[PDB]
Ligand binder design. Structure first.
Ligand SMILES: O=C(O)CCC(=O)C(=O)O
Ligand SMILES: [Fe+3]
Lengths: 428, 18
């Protein structure tokens, strides 16, 4: 932690006097002190870094995006001074990149990370941070290149292994991803004890038919990442009643359920008219959840936002649902038609959050061949009837009928969420 | 990408500061 250059050593008493104000929680006094030092010693890297750290603390205290933007600029100013110690330069830009990601400036974060790697090309850990940068904007191709270079220099870096494995799995290279995820988690390196990697390791093992999969679910549950071996969502509010199957009465949404069941044929008829006359509005499932088959969805609400063009194709259904904010305001759910054809098998999986319950209304249900398992219980749909399950539990679907199967999916807020939580939880 | 039915993205939420 060598932070002082030749000059900063001669003014260390003034620098320490300012930092002491910051460590003693006197943030506003600290900012003014470091501002004065910056004004008096405009080339001091330690003074400039002190100003940035005080601005950083001030933004936390005030919860101000505008103050944090100021800190992010001051962190950069440190890097442009002459004679900056390498440790100070690294610390300053790293914090800058971190704070850019916090604000959602992912492109800015990436440029900072590319500068850090150009300045310190032998620093493996900075390359790992850059790979994460790419993963956050969904750029799996560039993330993959970065971790390949890291695994070339240091083959047993456990952080690079799990992220490499995560990318392979996301690219549907299931069997290839398993040794990277497994060895990465077993390395115990910092950053590998993460629920995402246990989730995808157990799932890749389930898909290749490896019984060891449930060992990792149980280890993930023992390490605190999963509520149970069955319930493996990662964006959770703790304490919510956890139960695979729900009756209408237990949810308290009886008016919504009665409305769906009383009016189900109207919902069916608008779904069939879209199939027949606007089938381009049904989009294929795009989350790699199928082993095989054809499965498409026509989405009316997503993240609590009404899809206006979609509601032009199902206007009476959209009018009916407007009455029920417990589903239309569910920012962690959707409302959508779901069509599935014969020969379809949906892999076991869970949704991302325990904050919703998922209702299925049967619209066109073949007499045989269609079933849904949630946890250890298999059920089937009925036309005009609502089924309710918590899709944060492992569930699986088969379509082996002789014709198409159409249902209506309505997500509601978990009933035990308070209104404060419903309005403040980030959308998913 | 968004996490609708599954957990396939590296992150499912969006960061918007404070
Ligand atoms: O049966 C369907 O259309 C979808 C099944 C499923 O995985 C879900 O409802 O989350
Ligand atoms: Fe599902």
């Amino acid at each position: 932690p060598k932070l002082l250059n030749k000059f900063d050593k001669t003014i260390k008493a003034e620098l320490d006097a300012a930092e002491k104000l910051r460590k003693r929680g006197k943030i506003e006094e600290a900012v003014n002190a470091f501002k004065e030092l910056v004004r008096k010693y405009p080339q001091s890297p330690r003074a400039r870094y002190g100003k940035a750290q005080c601005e950083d603390d001030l933004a936390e205290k005030r919860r101000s995006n505008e103050v944090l933007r100021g800190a992010i600029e001051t962190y950069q100013e440190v890097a442009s001074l002459p004679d900056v110690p390498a440790d100070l330069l690294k610390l300053s830009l790293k914090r800058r990149s971190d704070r850019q990601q916090f604000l959602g400036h992912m492109r800015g974060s990436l440029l900072t990370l590319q500068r850090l790697v150009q300045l310190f090309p032998n620093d493996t850990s900075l390359k790992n941070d850059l790979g994460v940068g790419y993963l956050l904007i969904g750029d799996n191709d560039n993330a993959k290149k970065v971790y390949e270079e890291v695994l070339s220099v240091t083959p047993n870096d456990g952080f690079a292994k799990v992220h490499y494995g995560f990318i392979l799995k996301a690219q549907n290279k299931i069997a290839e991803s398993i040794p990277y995820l497994k060895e990465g988690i077993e390395s115990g390196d910092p950053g590998t004890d993460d629920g995402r990697f246990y989730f995808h390791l157990g799932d890749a093992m389930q898909r290749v038919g490896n019984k060891e999969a449930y060992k990792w679910y149980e280890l993930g549950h023992k390490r605190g990442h999963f509520a149970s071996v069955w319930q493996r969502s990662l964006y959770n509010v703790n304490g919510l009643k956890a139960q695979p199957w729900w009756t209408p009465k237990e949810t308290g949404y009886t008016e919504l359920v009665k409305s769906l069941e009383r009016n189900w044929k109207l919902i069916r008829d608008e779904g069939l008219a879209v199939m027949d006359k606007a089938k381009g509005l049904f989009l294929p499932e795009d989350e790699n959840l199928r082993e095989k088959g054809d499965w498409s969805q026509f989405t009316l609400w997503q993240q609590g936002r009404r899809n206006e063009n979609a509601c032009k194709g199902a206007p009476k259904t959209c009018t009916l649902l407007e009455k029920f904010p417990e589903t239309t305001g569910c920012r962690r759910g959707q409302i959508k038609y779901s069509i599935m054809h014969p020969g379809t098998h949906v892999w076991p999986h869970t949704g991302p959050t325990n904050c919703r319950l998922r209702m299925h209304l049967g619209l066109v249900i073949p007499k045989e061949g269609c079933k849904i398992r949630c946890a250890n219980e298999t059920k089937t749909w009925e036309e005009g009837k609502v089924l309710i399950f918590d899709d944060s539990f492992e569930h699986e679907v088969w379509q082996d009928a002789s014709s198409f199967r159409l249902i209506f999916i309505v997500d509601v807020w978990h009933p035990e969420l308070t209104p404060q939580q419903r309005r403040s939880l980030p959308a998913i | 990408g968004k996490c609708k039915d599954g957990l396939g993205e590296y992150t499912c939420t969006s960061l918007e500061g404070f």
